[PDB]
């Protein structure tokens, strides 16, 4: 289970994207008994918050999910080669953390919500 | 809720496969307060581990999920009639528990991972 955990942390983002399951399997498992229980409960609700974020987009039960949100060059103007073959995910997170909330807001604002409503309507004709 | 729980435990696997929801609904609900809380938390994280296993395959939100992993006759060389009309799920688990981890590894090794990557690529053309 723990084997290979974060082993691709220094890999390129393209190469680290083939190991997502090792880092996804590892997110789910007196006063000190209460401490351990608090840790376990916190891990559970954190995992559920991440899954809820994935589910309010179209990305439920998926480790890679393509969306309908266009990429804005105000967030990053690098070409795919610099991102997926020259950079790592930690560097990318450092670069893109200032816009992450804007991206999340756009992911749940229009694309999944208007998509869902449009599929509600396309199931009428 | 509890009605019919494990009632098809002695049924054939084919017949017990029509009652999966009674056994799926029943997996989710001082020092003794801590004991009850530990039990509840353990049940929650166990359920979430099972759902994570289903989701890293293509089986998210499904009680029956068809896959792209071929069956190997090194795991069981019985024909469908012996399995789904003559055997029960407990006997099948006793027979197949030695290979279960190999099957799980194959389920998350290539089929869902390469499928997902191929759907990443088919969403380009």
């Amino acid at each position: 289970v723990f084997l290979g955990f974060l082993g691709a942390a220094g890999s390129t983002m393209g190469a680290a994207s083939m190991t997502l399951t090792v880092q996804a399997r590892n997110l789910l498992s007196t006063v000190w008994g209460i401490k351990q229980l608090q840790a376990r409960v916190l891990a559970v609700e954190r995992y559920l918050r991440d899954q809820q974020l994935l589910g309010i987009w179209g990305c439920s039960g998926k480790l890679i999910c393509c969306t309908n949100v266009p990429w804005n060059s105000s967030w990053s103007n690098r070409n795919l080669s610099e991102i997926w073959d020259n950079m790592t995910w930690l560097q990318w997170d450092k670069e893109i953390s200032n816009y992450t909330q804007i991206i999340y807001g756009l992911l749940e604002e229009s694309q999944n919500q208007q998509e869902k409503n449009e599929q509600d309507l396309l199931a009428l004709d | 809720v509890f009605l019919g729980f494990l009632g098809a435990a002695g049924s054939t696997m084919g017949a017990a496969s029509m009652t999966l929801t009674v056994q799926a609904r029943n997996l989710l609900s001082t020092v003794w307060g801590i004991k009850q809380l530990q039990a509840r938390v353990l049940a929650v994280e166990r359920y979430l581990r099972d759902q994570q296993l289903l989701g890293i395959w293509g089986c998210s939100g499904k009680l029956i999920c068809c896959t792209n992993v071929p069956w190997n006759s090194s795991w069981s060389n019985r024909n469908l009639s012996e399995i789904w009309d003559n055997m029960t799920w407990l006997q099948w688990d006793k027979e197949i528990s030695n290979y279960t981890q190999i099957i799980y590894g194959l389920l998350e090794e290539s089929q869902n991972q390469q499928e997902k990557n191929e759907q990443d690529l088919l969403a380009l053309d």
Partner: antibody, heavy 123, light 108 residues
């Protein structure tokens, strides 16, 4: 430095079968989508088939959809094209080329960058 | 298929333009039009990709452009080596991937 050498072109009776192969060198074979494009002798080029970089996705022109089978081995740096139930319209020089598509993590390569020599198939 | 003139004639020093008419579904929908040069008796060579872009090792004399459903290849400063069959290619979508135009003979 890129080299793509085709082997297996020859004469085959109508209704026969033939396996063309293309050996690649001078570049990362596993990082490129491959394609087979045929030119009949007096006519122009015609796209036959396409395979992605990993070898999991295969596309064919409808004229050879159920008959041809493109495959690749990245360990051996080989690209195979199996041909079954060969008709008279398949007489052509077949070229293996690099391109046709790319991964989602790469720029679009909707073109055939590096071509091979050619392999003559006659029915 | 893509309609292409069977022949285009020129002399050294001038500039010629080979046209390529296609359906709206292929050239009018996607900006992926490419031009190959096949000298007689040898394999094709990519001269232009993505309408305008050039590979490495290709002179500025070869250029490409698009207008609506028609893509054009301009060859300037004609030379002896330019005598070849110039083939059009267009990405026609997911169902039909690539459609090639009829070869055009250049006479210098």
């Amino acid at each position: 430095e890129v080299q793509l050498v085709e082997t297996g072109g020859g004469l085959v009776q109508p209704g026969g079968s033939l396996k063309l192969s293309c050996r690649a060198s001078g570049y990362t074979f596993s990082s490129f989508a491959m394609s087979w494009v045929r030119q009949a002798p007096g006519k122009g080029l015609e796209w036959v088939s396409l395979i992605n970089d990993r070898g999991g996705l295969t596309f064919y022109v409808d004229s050879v959809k159920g008959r041809f089978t493109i495959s690749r081995d990245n360990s051996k740096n080989t690209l195979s094209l199996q041909m079954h139930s060969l008709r008279d319209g398949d007489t052509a020089v077949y070229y293996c080329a690099t391109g046709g598509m790319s991964s989602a993590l790469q720029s679009s390569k909707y073109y055939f960058d590096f071509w091979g020599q050619g392999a003559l198939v006659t029915v | 298929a893509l309609t292409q003139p069977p022949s285009v004639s020129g002399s050294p020093g001038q500039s010629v333009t080979i046209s390529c008419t296609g359906t709206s579904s292929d050239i009018g929908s996607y900006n992926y039009v490419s031009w190959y040069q096949q000298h007689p008796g040898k394999a094709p060579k990519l001269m232009i990709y993505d309408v305008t872009q050039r590979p490495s090792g290709v002179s500025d004399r070869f250029s490409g452009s698009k207008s609506g459903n028609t893509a054009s290849l301009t060859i300037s400063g004609l030379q002896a080596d330019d005598e070849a069959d110039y083939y059009c290619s267009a990405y026609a979508g997911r169902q039909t991937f690539y459609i090639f135009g009829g070869g055009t003979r250049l006479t210098v």
